[PDB]
Design a binder for these strands. Sequence first.
RNA 1: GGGGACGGGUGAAACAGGAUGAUCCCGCCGAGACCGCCGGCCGCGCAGGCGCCUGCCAAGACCGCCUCUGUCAAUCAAGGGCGAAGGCCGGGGGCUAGAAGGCGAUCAGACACCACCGUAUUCCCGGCCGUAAACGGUGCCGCCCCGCGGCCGGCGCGCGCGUCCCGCCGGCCGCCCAGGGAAACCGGGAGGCUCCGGGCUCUGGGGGGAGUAUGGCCGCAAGGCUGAAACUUGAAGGCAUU
Lengths: 198, 63, 231, 126, 98, 25
Amino acid sequence: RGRGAPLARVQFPNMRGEGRVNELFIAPEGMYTGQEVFSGNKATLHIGNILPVGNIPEGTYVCNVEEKPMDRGCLARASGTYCLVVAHNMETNKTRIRLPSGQKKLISSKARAMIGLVAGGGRTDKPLLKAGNAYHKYKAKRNCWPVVRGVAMNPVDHPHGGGNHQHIGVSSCVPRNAVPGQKVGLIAARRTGCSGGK
Amino acid sequence: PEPINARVIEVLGRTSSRGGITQVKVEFMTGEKRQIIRNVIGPVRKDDILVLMESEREARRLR
Amino acid sequence: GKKKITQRKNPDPYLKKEWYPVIAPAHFKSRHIGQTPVTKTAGLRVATDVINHRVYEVNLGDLNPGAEDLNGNTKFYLQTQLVSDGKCLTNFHGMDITRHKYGSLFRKGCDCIDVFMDIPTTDGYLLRVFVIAFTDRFRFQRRKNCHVKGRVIRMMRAGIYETLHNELGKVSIPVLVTKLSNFEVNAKLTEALQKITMCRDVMIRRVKVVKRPRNTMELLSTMHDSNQVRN
Amino acid sequence: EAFAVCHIYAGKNDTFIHVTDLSGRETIGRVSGGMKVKRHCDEPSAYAAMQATQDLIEIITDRGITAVHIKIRADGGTGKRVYGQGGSAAIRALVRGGIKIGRIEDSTPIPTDRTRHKGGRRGRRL
Amino acid sequence: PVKRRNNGRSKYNCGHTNIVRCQNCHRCVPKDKVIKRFTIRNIVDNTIADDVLNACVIQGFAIPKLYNKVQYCVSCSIHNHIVRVRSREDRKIRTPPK
Amino acid sequence: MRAKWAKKRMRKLKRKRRHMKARSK
RNA sequence: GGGGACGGGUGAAACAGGAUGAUCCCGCCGAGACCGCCGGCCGCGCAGGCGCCUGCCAAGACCGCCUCUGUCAAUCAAGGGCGAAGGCCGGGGGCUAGAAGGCGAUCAGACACCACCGUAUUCCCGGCCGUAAACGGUGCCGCCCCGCGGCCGGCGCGCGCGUCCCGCCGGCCGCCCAGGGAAACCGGGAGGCUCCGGGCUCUGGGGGGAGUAUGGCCGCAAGGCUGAAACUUGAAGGCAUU
């Protein structure tokens, strides 16, 4: 309901019983009804297979990576996102991955990942177009819409509050150690403004 | 280092665009007797002995 | 003795700087590379562990003395791996020709065939071997230019790759250093290319260690530690 | 014979005669033209290079470097590729002082392919 | 009128050549319209050549040669005298002087 | 390059003349 | 990590860089661009253009030919596709250089040249734009034409036998006999033309005004394309000689 990315129900055999176990996963693009996915150390390198990232070669696009061993997956889970296997440090049994934000993190080689980009990519390209479409999307997620600017509000309601000319009146940049009511502007901004570079 | 005297072996020519510099190849009168080329001001001729202040510095050949 | 502070006074930074002998692999006739100065063990920097992986460029003319007409324009890079008995045992890090040699091979009128083959050694090292080959004028010929037609270039490029595979396919780092020191492999590639067309200056210009295994102490005993094994 | 490598940076703007111990990790002494000259344009000059060495040589002889391998370089990279006037003097000043030369080599940094050099397509229209 | 048949560049069977930078002036000139002079000078000065050899401990050492190709633009070449304004007849002479 | 600078001046003036017509009509 | 005091930059400087250890040396790593020397009177492509390695995919001219077809052709309004760079619109990416901007000089002034920092841009993908001194300032297809050389590709002939030699065909070129031209020059044409006619398309008609105005079409825009008149003036221009 609340996720743009599609979710796939993959049925596995029960290994502690005679039944079958149903597991819901984030769907990597290319998962089809009837695809035989494999989970494990000896799983082959095919999209939708889950293997430890030390086995996974470098340059591979993976998703739902485990931040720590046996975490059940915490990393690239949003639509179209992917992590990249960057390097393997055999001596430390640690694998560097490039997170979707372009940050690089060292994870355990044991930590497992599902091969493939997560589906639903290009979801953000279409303009919402109408306030309506935002209403529909936010209903599925939580009450965070519509957003009222604090300059519009009274001085009691918000720090930016309200004067005669609708202005912040003090720097929007607020410190990192600001208290819960005070932290309303740009938090610990290392720099501000629209400028080219990086 | 005291200056070392050197005798002119060949007067190479007149330089400085005003001719006042004279280019001369000078062989150290005493010592290793290296033949270096040094700029000179004034009237100079073959076998003229002039004390070189450093001698480790030489002008561009025939320039 | 090539040392200073070990036995004598020096300037203030070098007052605490002892010197350690560096020794090349057994294949080379001149084992002594030289002395390396390291500051004495201060706190967390053991002097021996500071000179643990230092790579020195030594001319093959220096490493193997004798005629410089042959071997005088090649340099081997030897990286210290272990420091034993206050001496730095060294292995292989790369081989290259000198800049003077590289610019001498090039001439107008000729065709340059330069290709790289990544050859894994049995020792667990991945080596990128760069070989440069130049087409030469025929014995007689009418035209001044020594340029070849495509069929010839394709055969030369293929024969370079094919002969490297036979020469250095099952090579090991000790065997490879011997093959580089006496240029057998360079001669073999020259012979094959000569059959295709008149060729000149066909030799491995540079070899590089792309991936090196760790714990290469067994490799040091075969090479630097013992001469009898490398025969 | 004790041997070091004396990198000679012969470039426009300044000359650096710097001696390092083979590996290049450790320096047995470093000198520049601008450390021996007061005029900025005389920094790349033969006199400063001859003054800078003979002062370098004193430090390295104290440190016991009897002989040196020369590795002269130009500004190199995307520009220059020719040595400055000081570069010749530095080798001559090392030879005269009693440093035995070993291998002279060209260490100019040279590009297999290059990033656009400074100056514009029209160039330095001085 | 048209001073030169080649148009000042050697472009034949071509619509576009590579771009070279004049070393002194740092300008962009086509490869065909460039001075292209290749020079092999010994690494050391010929005045200091013999004394380097005497100093050199290595026996049989040969002084390194420096191999470089100096490419310049017409303005950054006529002013350095690498090429000279020639007479209309002398301009036609394609043979290198000396 | 007076002829190129002449066409730069002309384009700038025709742009302005378009703006005045945009203010009207 | 080492070492110690000035580095940068210039024509000479200066502004930034440095005991928070700069410059320099060496190891190592990340990022993106780019492919040197070879590299050219080399080649390919319809032009614009095209150079890392290793594959994959589809081409094209040329040559050879006792293969097939049988005029299927030439040139082309409208129409279709392509088109350097810069620009623009979405995504990215961001090493260098660097329109703008800021500085330090210069100078009488200098918001120019030169130094320095640096945004768009440069690079990729999906599009727009539709222009260049897009030049060989030389449309295309066809015929004949004078020698003398160079290179490239294919093929044939002798000959010991060589990346020979002599041809042939296609291409790229240099010199040039006539011939042409106002001459420079062209001569593989700008020859065979006041002794004027092979076919086809396009453009010009003194110099401005003016590629302006207005109308149309096209593009998101920048702009493109089509394109005046009133009015002004006696030269404008080419090539050569001094």
